[PDB]
Amino acid sequence: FIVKATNGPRYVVGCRRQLDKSKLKPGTRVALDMTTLTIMRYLPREVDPLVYNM
Amino acid sequence: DLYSRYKKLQQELEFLEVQEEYIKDEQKNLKKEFLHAQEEVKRIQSIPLVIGQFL
Numbered sequence: 001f002i003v004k005a006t007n008g009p010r011y012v013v014g015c016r017r018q019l020d021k022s023k024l025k026p027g028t029r030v031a032l033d034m035t036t037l038t039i040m041r042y043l044p045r046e047v048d049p050l051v052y053n054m
Numbered sequence: 055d056l057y058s059r060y061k062k063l064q065q066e067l068e069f070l071e072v073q074e075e076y077i078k079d080e081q082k083n084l085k086k087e088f089l090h091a092q093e094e095v096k097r098i099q100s101i102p103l104v105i106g107q108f109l
Contacts, residue, residue: 002105010105037102 001039003032013038 001024003011013032015021019039024030031041 012100012103 001030003030003039011037015039 001013003013005011015024015038019042023042024039029043029045030039031043032038033040
């Protein structure tokens with residue numbers, strides 16, 4: 001998978017072992033490893049509350 | 055000199071036939087060495103590669 005460091009660059013990662021590779025669709029947010037940098041844990045969220053406040 | 059020339063042609067022959075075997079073994083060896091070169095260098099794979107640009 002190609003991930004998005006929110007200050008910058010883009011990488012190549014993998015899962016831990018069994019992180020449900022069908023769940024990790026383009027559009028999810030994951031937690032990335034510190035050293036290995038690969039995917040650790042999925043998350044929700046999304047962005048600007050001008051959609052939300054209406 | 056037909057007792058000593060015919061003695062030593064055999065000698066230098068058996069010498070070179072021994073000496074062939076060294077390079078036969080090294081040719082057996084270096085193909086394995088080149089395969090180890092191939093794969094153990096081509097482990098240069100995706101340690102988590104970064105996206106950039108080429109100019």
